Design an enzyme around this catalytic site. Structure first.
Site, PDB file in Angstrom:
ATOM      1  N   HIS A  96      28.128  50.642 -26.250  1.00 38.15           N
ATOM      2  CA  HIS A  96      27.023  50.404 -25.316  1.00 38.15           C
ATOM      3  C   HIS A  96      27.327  50.763 -23.860  1.00 38.15           C
ATOM      4  O   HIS A  96      28.403  50.444 -23.349  1.00 38.15           O
ATOM      5  CB  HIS A  96      26.586  48.937 -25.385  1.00 38.15           C
ATOM      6  CG  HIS A  96      25.774  48.600 -26.596  1.00 38.15           C
ATOM      7  ND1 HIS A  96      24.500  48.075 -26.516  1.00 38.15           N
ATOM      8  CD2 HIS A  96      26.052  48.713 -27.918  1.00 38.15           C
ATOM      9  CE1 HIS A  96      24.030  47.877 -27.735  1.00 38.15           C
ATOM     10  NE2 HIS A  96      24.951  48.259 -28.603  1.00 38.15           N
ATOM     11  N   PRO A  97      26.371  51.437 -23.191  1.00 35.92           N
ATOM     12  CA  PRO A  97      26.403  51.681 -21.742  1.00 35.92           C
ATOM     13  C   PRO A  97      26.124  50.410 -20.939  1.00 35.92           C
ATOM     14  O   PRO A  97      26.233  50.443 -19.712  1.00 35.92           O
ATOM     15  CB  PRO A  97      25.270  52.693 -21.528  1.00 35.92           C
ATOM     16  CG  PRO A  97      25.060  53.324 -22.861  1.00 35.92           C
ATOM     17  CD  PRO A  97      25.309  52.216 -23.846  1.00 35.92           C
ATOM     18  N   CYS A  98      25.756  49.322 -21.620  1.00 41.11           N
ATOM     19  CA  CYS A  98      25.608  48.018 -20.973  1.00 41.11           C
ATOM     20  C   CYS A  98      26.876  47.738 -20.182  1.00 41.11           C
ATOM     21  O   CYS A  98      27.982  47.826 -20.720  1.00 41.11           O
ATOM     22  CB  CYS A  98      25.371  46.906 -21.998  1.00 41.11           C
ATOM     23  SG  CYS A  98      23.816  47.022 -22.921  1.00 41.11           S
ATOM     24  N   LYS A  99      26.707  47.399 -18.909  1.00 39.47           N
ATOM     25  CA  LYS A  99      27.812  47.418 -17.967  1.00 39.47           C
ATOM     26  C   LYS A  99      28.115  48.874 -17.640  1.00 39.47           C
ATOM     27  O   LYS A  99      27.295  49.557 -17.029  1.00 39.47           O
ATOM     28  CB  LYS A  99      29.044  46.719 -18.543  1.00 39.47           C
ATOM     29  CG  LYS A  99      28.793  45.275 -18.959  1.00 39.47           C
ATOM     30  CD  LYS A  99      28.342  44.409 -17.780  1.00 39.47           C
ATOM     31  CE  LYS A  99      26.826  44.198 -17.763  1.00 39.47           C
ATOM     32  NZ  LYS A  99      26.387  43.243 -16.691  1.00 39.47           N
ATOM     33  N   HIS A 100      29.280  49.352 -18.061  1.00 35.62           N
ATOM     34  CA  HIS A 100      29.680  50.743 -17.825  1.00 35.62           C
ATOM     35  C   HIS A 100      29.703  51.141 -16.347  1.00 35.62           C
ATOM     36  O   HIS A 100      30.448  52.039 -15.958  1.00 35.62           O
ATOM     37  CB  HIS A 100      28.807  51.719 -18.627  1.00 35.62           C
ATOM     38  CG  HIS A 100      29.439  52.196 -19.900  1.00 35.62           C
ATOM     39  ND1 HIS A 100      29.031  53.341 -20.550  1.00 35.62           N
ATOM     40  CD2 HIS A 100      30.448  51.682 -20.644  1.00 35.62           C
ATOM     41  CE1 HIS A 100      29.761  53.512 -21.639  1.00 35.62           C
ATOM     42  NE2 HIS A 100      30.628  52.519 -21.719  1.00 35.62           N
TER      43      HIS A 100
END
Ligand code: ZN
Ligand code: ZN
Lengths: 180, 598, 592, 186
Positions: A142-146
């Site tokens: 996931h790009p969640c955060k990133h």
């Protein structure tokens, strides 16, 4: 701009992408084929980057039979990694496809062995590679955060290498897969 | 210092899922043909060979069928074919030696017209398109013609500056496997008239084994010898795109030469990891079988609860619980759907009736089209449509109401035995029957067969959920659930012919299943709580004020389902006792002792 | 008196549904469209003529098709036929008088061979199977031959003790319509040689009308006059199986006698109750149509709640509530089932997504076969498959999360307008979105369109049901959990959260029960209706099986209904929304 | 045994009803016919009782077209009285007779289920009245059922007020309070 936000325009992607493929020619941009589900905002030939068969020596958290007999006349793993652009979280997005020591596809729960513990149970999932038309199962992160993340590591004492930073982040995720 | 030249396997096969995927798509099982032959094209990349590999990857995808398609700069195109078999047996008894020899002869016929075309590969395959099991074997025809010919070699340190020129020449001439020096030491295309004089041959090598060239090497030497049979001694450059290129003084020798009709020595079936000349067999269900994909997606969804929130949560003990649902009405339907969301896999419905016109709006397993059909078997079937891996089964079976004359001993005597059976057979028994007179017997049997029982009853705007067996708690019958002084609406609880508010049954169901899961978790050290929370004896809910009560109730000495004098009388008198209780229930109180207190 | 004999219609038709069922069966079996003609049989019970009838019931069932399906004692078999038409034009344009007259000719032909065989009946019909509508007309051909002949009569009390013998003679002789006296005044069959001398004719009468004989009498008289042309005076006994038998002194008269081929006046088409000589049309859909039969069993179910338990309950305002379900996820599926169990008939789904592999275990409208197909449309289809009368509809339609830059201004502007129109079109709006960012825009539009909004949200083991109403807070007036709370209470409405399967079940039910209770009339001075309390907010937790009810005032500075936020909207339309979706800190400034 | 319970056997139901059809000859036993779905605990010709077209003049609460423009032209140039078919069945799940009623309007065409309810007494309608096919015919017809659930109970109470021949005569006295607007031909 990006170092402030932590995100990249699709025009910046092509920039870091071309740079990454230049400095590590082992990464490549896709070809145009009819099985790719293109995106209008990216050029046809700069959709997603890809590297093939990177060896994984060990697993992540420590780094018929009759017929086969009649017809007679643990181990290493190989990973294809893809890098695509996420529209939602204006940042790069990670997908991996795995092979056992025989060159056969790994099961989605075998590839999990090669994801670090914290990422494995918190920020990872099984997914159709989104850019191939009739498509292929993988493990995504996931790009969640990133960024978040990319904004942290960035601030170290030039946009072209947004992807070389991003890559060192990734090695933290799949630490068994060889890197350079 | 002089050795007989030996060779390494030319290629390492990698089969992508899209490759198998594209076989299916071509509808080859649906075709009444014993075998089928199609051309393949892979683009070799000799600049990116894995350290742990000893030779170039031969990577087969769906795109391998497209014959042309776009190719990357300096990637070497390799032409092959896949022969697919529809009959496993003829995959198995295919003469592998003779088959690969036939592929070699083609390479030969091509090679003598153009030496850069004497190289190929073949995939033989059998696909079990239902079990998603694929069997295959890569063949790479590498031939010594004639068989008698072998090669003596010795290191040649002196040709080092050439390797750069050759590497760089092969990159450009991507369709070429061979090049030579002309009289000026310039690199040029292979030409028999030139090499006959200059005697220097460079091959584009596909192996990375120190000092061991790809077995493709033999194919090229075989052509060379045929163009130049008078050639004894020449230089051989083995070119690689890393630092491991080498040169050799090479000499053609001969073992047991045949008369001045050349046969040929063929090899190149790929080995497995274990080192064996044997096919690969592969299970791709986990990647292609949509049953097996969904099934694993359900179990991932559930495991994300354990990992993200409740680490010491036991998902397994749940999945393996054999649940018997006595009742396939409003309650059985909602309970079963909660059970599958929690990953229960064995569910068995029991119900005597039939889908009515009024049912589908309230009973969430049936459609309008289902009306008139038997309930149990239809419910089971509805579960399978939702999730096919489900061991769902229905059993049409009457449960004898208490205080009712029997209509037919034997059929009911048989229904008894069959009821007890299903009960012993399972782990958790849900009582989702319609009236209390139908709870009696299945309470009793479930007592007797030491089973955990979850009752769920409904009134118009309230419900009761409560567990029995497994401090001593007592069952549904130990105590008057509702008092006769209570209100008209509380009194509707577990009455038959009670129209219930639609939401009552959904709440009752969800809480009954959450009560189950919790019950299956280990209890904490001296608390009555699990990792999922509390495990009350009894939950009562009321809609008109959106409220929930938890209570516990003591077992009762003269209870008509629990009393000692009642387990006693059953144990011994079995069916005959049960019969008399069903018809004359004052008898039952006579035994329990309840008669002697009134 | 004396009078001119007049007549009552012979029969009163009764059609059982089984007659129309057996008609349909036989009609689905042929493809040809030609009109057809089949024999019919009824068994008359002249001993059971209901008091409010004036003639014997003629009762058609599926059995009337099946030749002579046995027979009781004292019952009289009546032979008939049905002409079915398969084109309504043929049925409509058939010359009815001509048709009945031709039937009368057959009866006459039969009659002159055997006076007892001159009586029949005919049904003409058109069956519209799809609409379950059946057209029909009973005809009983009653004939005067010649037409010029009429009957003068006057009472004959004297022949009174005779009636018992005839009554009883008729019960035994069930295939007879007529008998006579011989020379010793004993009953025998009709013979022309005897009645020429004896002059006494008794008829088995199908009417109960006082002193008025059934029109079949014309038939028997016509045959009599032909067998005995010179007969002028005779006694006529009208025998009935009640106490209403009578005797007549009878004289053949004649009006415009033509001279030697006699003509024929036929009557006998049955009337409707309005007294009109017109065909019958019946709608048997409510009795035969499986779909309409289910609609009825379901409406009955809901009424029983109102009759047995809550008499003051308003079931109809529910039925007619048009419900928009924003979301076809776990919640949307379950809410919608609760709704149909309550008799809601128009439900419209809104969801931008696709059924996934893991969805069918949790989302109760989807099967394994459904994976890959768009949710919203498919959900509506699943409702119709359950109850086909459902005005179920699905709209694939993204809802802009707040705090997100856009991706297609034009495509989303079209989504926005399409959203707002869906709302204005509907009566109650359920917000069943995945997270709170997707919650803001529906809230605002509902607060602006003045709709009742039931919100539902899920945490790992908790749910939240609330209603913004037509002043009560909206979802956004106050934080829905403290930032201090348990890590599992802060899962509420997070887009990343797994939930315990039961949460969505409980939440759905409470949301729907809160709606129905809310639709009801509130009592004086309390926040209760006939279905109970109508709490603002309900909050529940599974880990301890507990429920909270609570209340929240509208917030001055709320981002979704604060009056300065509503101002900015109706003034600066979508341009305002756009900036709000993108610059949430800007939205803060409008509310304060 | 039966004024004790208020319940009868199959053997006895046949008696109470052979008596009824003899006393009130308007009630008849079914005929052996191919469209009945027989029960083996009774004889073929003693499955159930029938009375036909009993009138109801008042109602229980007080005691596109096109088709129309088609009927008008096909035309050649107090209401509703209603008529009821009453059937008497034997229940096995209880030991009591169960009655079914099938109605017709004044034109002799069938009544909708909604309409038939108007002739059920408001108490008996709101608690013990259901819609149901006649369960002794195959190709089946809608009717109102009524509907045990209880019954004797209610029958033994009427027997708390002498042979078994007259059991169905007393049942009919009850039934009359259920459908108080249908004439008393029984
Ligand atoms: Zn007990
Ligand atoms: Zn607000």
């Amino acid at each position: 701009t990006f170092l402030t936000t932590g995100q990249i325009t699709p025009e910046e992607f092509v920039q870091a992408g071309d740079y990454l493929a230049h400095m590590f020619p082992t990464w490549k941009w896709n070809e145009e084929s009819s099985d790719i589900s293109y995106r209008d905002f990216l050029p046809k030939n700069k959709q997603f980057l890809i590297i093939r068969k990177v060896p994984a020596d060990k697993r992540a958290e420590q780094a018929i039979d009759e017929l086969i007999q009649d017809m007679e006349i643990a181990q290493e793993r190989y990973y294809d990694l893809y890098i695509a652009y996420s529209t939602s979280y204006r940042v790069p997005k990670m997908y991996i496809v795995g092979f056992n020591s025989n060159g056969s596809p790994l099961s989605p729960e075998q590839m999990f062995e090669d994801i670090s513990a914290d990422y494995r149970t918190k920020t990872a999932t099984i997914e159709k590679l989104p850019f191939y038309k009739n498509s292929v199962l993988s493990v995504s992160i996931h790009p969640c955060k990133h960024a978040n993340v990319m904004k942290i590591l960035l601030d170290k004492v030039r946009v072209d290498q947004y992807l070389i930073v991003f890559l060192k982040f990734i090695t933290s995720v799949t630490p068994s897969i060889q890197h350079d | 210092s002089e050795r007989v030249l030996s060779y390494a396997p030319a290629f390492k096969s990698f089969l992508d899922t899209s490759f198998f995927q594209e076989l299916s798509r071509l509808k080859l099982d649906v075709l009444k043909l014993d075998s089928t032959c199609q051309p393949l094209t892979v683009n070799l990349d000799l600049h990116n060979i894995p350290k742990s590999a000893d030779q170039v990857p031969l990577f087969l995808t769906n795109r391998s069928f497209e014959k042309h398609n776009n190719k990357r700069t300096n990637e070497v195109p390799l032409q092959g074919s896949i022969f697919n078999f529809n009959v496993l047996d003829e995959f198995k008894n295919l003469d592998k030696q003779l088959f690969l020899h036939q592929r070699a002869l083609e390479c030969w016929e091509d090679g003598i017209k153009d030496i850069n075309k004497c190289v190929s590969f073949v995939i033989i395959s059998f696909a079990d398109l239902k079990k998603y099991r694929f069997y295959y074997w890569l063949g790479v025809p590498c031939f010594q013609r004639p068989s008698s010919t072998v090669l003596h070699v010795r290191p040649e340190p002196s040709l080092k500056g050439l390797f750069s020129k050759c590497q760089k020449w092969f990159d450009v001439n991507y369709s070429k496997w061979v090049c030579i020096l002309d009289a000026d030491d310039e690199i040029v295309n292979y030409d028999k008239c030139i090499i006959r004089k200059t005697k220097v041959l460079a091959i584009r090598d596909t192996s990375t084994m120190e000092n061991v060239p790809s077995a493709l090497t033999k194919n090229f030497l075989s052509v060379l010898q045929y163009d130049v049979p008078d050639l004894i001694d020449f230089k051989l450059l083995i070119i690689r795109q890393n630092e491991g290129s080498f040169a050799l003084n090479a000499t053609f020798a001969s073992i047991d030469p045949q008369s001045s009709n050349p046969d040929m020595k063929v090899s190149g079936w790929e080995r497995n990891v274990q080192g064996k000349l044997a096919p690969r067999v592969v299970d791709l269900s986990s990647l292609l079988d949509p049953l097996k994909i969904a099934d694993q997606s359900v179990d991932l969804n559930l495991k994300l609860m354990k990992w993200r929130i409740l680490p010491d949560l036991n998902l397994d003990i749940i999945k393996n619980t054999k649940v018997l649902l006595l009742g396939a009405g409003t309650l059985g339907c909602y309970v079963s759907r909660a059970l599958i969301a929690w990953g229960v896999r064995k569910i068995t419905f029991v119900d005597n009736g039939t889908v009515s016109y009024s049912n589908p709006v309230r009973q969430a397993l049936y459609n309008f089209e289902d009306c008139g059909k038997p309930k149990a078997e239809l419910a089971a079937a509805s579960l399978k449509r939702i999730f096919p891996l489900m061991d769902a089964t229905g059993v049409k079976l009457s449960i004898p109401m208490i205080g009712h004359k029997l209509v037919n001993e034997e059929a009911q005597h048989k229904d008894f035995d069959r009821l007890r059976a299903l009960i012993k057979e399972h782990d958790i028994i849900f009582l989702l029957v319609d009236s209390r007179e139908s709870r009696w017997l299945p309470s009793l049997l479930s007592n007797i067969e030491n089973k955990t029982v979850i009752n769920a009853a409904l009134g118009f705007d309230s419900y009761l959920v409560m567990r029995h067996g497994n401090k001593q708690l007592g069952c549904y019958f130990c105590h008057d659930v509702v008092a006769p002084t209570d209100s008209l609406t509380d009194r509707t609880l577990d009455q038959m012919c009670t129209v219930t508010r639609p939401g009552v049954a959904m709440m009752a169901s969800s809480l009954a299943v959450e009560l189950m899961t919790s019950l299956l978790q280990t209890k904490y050290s001296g608390s009555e709580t699990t990792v999922l929370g509390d495990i009350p004896h009894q939950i009562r809910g009321f809609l008109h004020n959106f409220s929930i009560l938890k209570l516990e109730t003591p077992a009762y000495e003269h209870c008509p389902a629990c009393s000692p004098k009642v387990i006693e009388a059953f144990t011994d008198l079995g069916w005959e006792f049960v019969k008399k209780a069903l018809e004359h229930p004052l008898y039952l109180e006579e035994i329990s002792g309840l008669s002697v207190i009134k």
